[PDB]
Design a protein around this ligand. Structure first.
Ligand SMILES: CCCCCCCCCCCCCCCCCC(=O)OC[C@H](COP(=O)([O-])OCC(O)COP(=O)([O-])OC[C@@H](COC(=O)CCCCCCCCCCCCCCCCC)OC(=O)CCCCCCCCCCCCCCCCC)OC(=O)CCCCCCCCCCCCCCCCC
Ligand SMILES: CCCCCCCCCCCCCCCCCC(=O)OC[C@H](COP(=O)([O-])OCC[N+](C)(C)C)OC(=O)CCCCCCCCCCCCCCCCC
Lengths: 57, 77
């Protein structure tokens, strides 16, 4: 009725602070894993060159 | 021989019930050293070294309810 309740009350602020940091840590890691991915596609000039060769030019 | 008597804490028990039906933080402890046995970090004990905290707290409360209030005249230990 008295003792355990008081010590639970004492624990609340630190646990709240640590869990807020843990949540921020998760969000930070989520952002850090994001990285714009640029793709490379076959240049059309080689297509235009193969087109020309096929013509027997 | 069986003597039936009562402690002198009944009013204090009433006050405890009245004032501790809701939770309150405790930040001042007469014997705080029972909570901090290890002072160098990375040291740990496999023995239940914090088993004394509860008994310590209850003993402090009981002995304080008796001894400190005994300064009031006619209060009995
Ligand atoms: C022959 C004559 C009679 C006597 C017979 C005795 C027989 C003895 C047999 C042999 C035994 C040998 C060994 C003895 C060793 C003694 C050692 C000793 O005393 O050490 C000191 C030591 C002192 O301790 P303490 O620090 O003072 O704390 C104990 C306190 O009790 C306070 O501690 P606590 O507050 O932590 O306790 C918890 C408390 C938590 O707090 C509370 O619950 C609050 C209430 C506290 C009550 C207890 C305190 C008592 C205060 C004094 C008496 C109050 C007024 C009584 C009025 C009497 C009027 C005549 O809860 C309770 O007390 C639970 C009970 C609650 C009862 C509520 C009843 C409600 C009824 C409502 C009815 C409504 C009807 C409506 C109808 C409508 C119709 C239209 O005593 C003890 O530890 C207890 C010793 C008991 C040993 C066992 C004895 C056997 C049982 C006997 C029962 C007799 C019943 C019949 C009586 C009938 C009237 C005559
Ligand atoms: C943390 C430290 C706490 C320190 C507290 C300090 C309190 C200071 C008190 C100043 C004086 C008070 C005078 C009161 C007078 C009352 C009427 C009277 O006649 O009394 C005379 C009585 C006796 O005076 P007397 O001995 O002259 O009486 C004469 C009577 N004849 C002649 C018949 C013998 O005064 C006292 O006994 C007062 C002593 C007080 C000592 C301090 C007790 C502190 C511990 C109890 C704290 C309780 C807190 C509870 C809170 C709730 C808990 C859940």
């Amino acid at each position: 009725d008295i003792m355990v309740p008081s010590f639970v009350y004492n624990k609340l602020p630190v646990i709240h602070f640590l869990q807020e940091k843990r949540a921020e840590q998760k969000l930070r890691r989520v952002l850090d894993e994001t990285y714009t991915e640029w793709t490379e596609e076959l240049d059309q000039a080689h297509v235009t060159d193969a087109i020309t060769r096929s013509l027997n030019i | 021989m069986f003597l039936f008597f009562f402690c002198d804490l009944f009013w204090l028990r009433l006050l405890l019930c009245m004032y501790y039906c809701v939770w309150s933080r405790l930040c001042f402890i007469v014997y705080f050293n029972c909570l901090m046995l290890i002072f160098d970090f990375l040291l740990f004990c496999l023995f239940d070294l914090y088993l004394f905290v509860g008994l310590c707290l209850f003993l402090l409360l009981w002995f304080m309810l008796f001894n400190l209030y005994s300064l009031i005249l006619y209060y009995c230990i």
